[PDB]
Amino acid sequence: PQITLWQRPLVTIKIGGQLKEALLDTGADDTVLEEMSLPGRWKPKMIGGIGGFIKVRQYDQILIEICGHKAIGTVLVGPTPVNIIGRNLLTQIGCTLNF
Amino acid sequence: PQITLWQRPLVTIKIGGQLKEALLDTGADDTVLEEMSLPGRWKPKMIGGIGGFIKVRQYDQILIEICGHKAIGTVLVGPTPVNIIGRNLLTQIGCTLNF
Ligand SMILES: CNC(=O)[C@@H](NC(=O)[C@H](OCc1ccc(-c2cccnc2)cc1)[C@H](O)[C@@H](O)[C@@H](OCc1ccc(-c2cccnc2)cc1)C(=O)N[C@H](C(=O)NC)C(C)C)C(C)C
């Protein structure tokens, strides 16, 4: 579809059988979700953004559905104020910026 | 043009007669630029990012050219790791997300 930016580009995503709201963020290199439980091993990591860095748990090869489109990739879990879908997954669903 | 997301969507912007690179950021409500000098009075604003909140200087009706597209709007100046072109300006140049 074509999503305008008059409002925040929020979409529904499905991960681990849970339905959640997330922001399509072209400014984010990675995907970061609110604290939740995921299967498998994880690695500690620090990610920075506006306001500084936060500590997150890194899980690889996680399956996520974005507006029907399935995508696999790394997902970071931590104290983020909003769920962020970054470029690592945006590319997988063929999302592009146009003007 | 059509921009893919395999790399950061960095573009060249012109402001105050100078060229700088910035990120087309759909995850940002506002446009935030690294410390610089701008004309006029400024007002205070507190913005929140992934790592917390930071104080910035708000300048209004600032002319900024993004990839040949002229825009005039509000720009925030503060301690940001990178220049960010937010939705307030992306809408002015007709930018949309597609997939
Ligand atoms: C390498 N690091 C990244 O790639 C990081 N990217 C960013 O932070 C992007 O910024 C560019 C950027 C790129 C690289 C580095 C970097 C770092 C270290 C080293 N090198 C480069 C630093 C910044 C984002 O799109 C940013 O813009 C946006 O984040 C999403 C968001 C939206 C709403 C609330 C939110 C907060 C409070 C209430 N409601 C919502 C909280 C967060 C955000 O903070 N939006 C704000 C917003 O819209 N707030 C409402 C505006 C005002 C900026 C990711 C790991 C998340």
Side-chain angles (χ1 to χ4, degrees), chain A residues 8 23-32 45-54 76 80-84 86-87, chain B residues 8 23-32 45-54 56 76 80-87:
Chain A
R8 292 177 182 168
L23 186 67
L24 300 180
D25 197 340
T26 62
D29 294 347
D30 304 298
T31 291
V32 53
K45 186 183 178 186
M46 287 282 268
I47 53 178
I50 288 297
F53 291 73
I54 57 169
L76 308 178
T80 176
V82 59
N83 291 309
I84 304 306
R87 298 188 296 102
Chain B
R8 293 182 175 170
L23 190 60
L24 300 179
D25 195 338
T26 58
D29 295 349
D30 307 316
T31 290
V32 195
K45 188 176 187 185
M46 194 86 102
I47 62 176
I50 202 63
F53 298 70
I54 62 171
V56 298
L76 308 182
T80 174
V82 299
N83 293 314
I84 296 169
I85 303 303
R87 293 190 299 98

Side-chain angles (χ1 to χ4, degrees), chain A residues 1-3 5-9 24-27 29 49-51 54 80 87 91-99, chain B residues 1-3 5-9 24-27 29 49-52 54 69 80 87 91 93-99:
Chain A
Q2 180 177 71
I3 302 180
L5 305 166
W6 296 110
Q7 294 90 52
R8 292 177 182 168
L24 300 180
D25 197 340
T26 62
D29 294 347
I50 288 297
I54 57 169
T80 176
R87 298 188 296 102
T91 57
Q92 300 303 280
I93 63 177
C95 180
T96 61
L97 214 48
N98 305 78
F99 63 102
Chain B
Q2 173 166 280
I3 297 181
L5 303 172
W6 304 97
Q7 306 304 310
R8 293 182 175 170
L24 300 179
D25 195 338
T26 58
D29 295 349
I50 202 63
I54 62 171
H69 297 60
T80 174
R87 293 190 299 98
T91 51
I93 64 172
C95 190
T96 62
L97 277 173
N98 299 268
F99 64 94

Side-chain angles (χ1 to χ4, degrees), chain A residues 15-16 33 38-40 59-64 71-75 89:
Chain A
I15 176 173
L33 306 180
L38 287 176
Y59 293 82
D60 297 314
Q61 283 132 292
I62 301 295
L63 169 61
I64 299 182
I72 297 71
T74 296
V75 176
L89 298 188

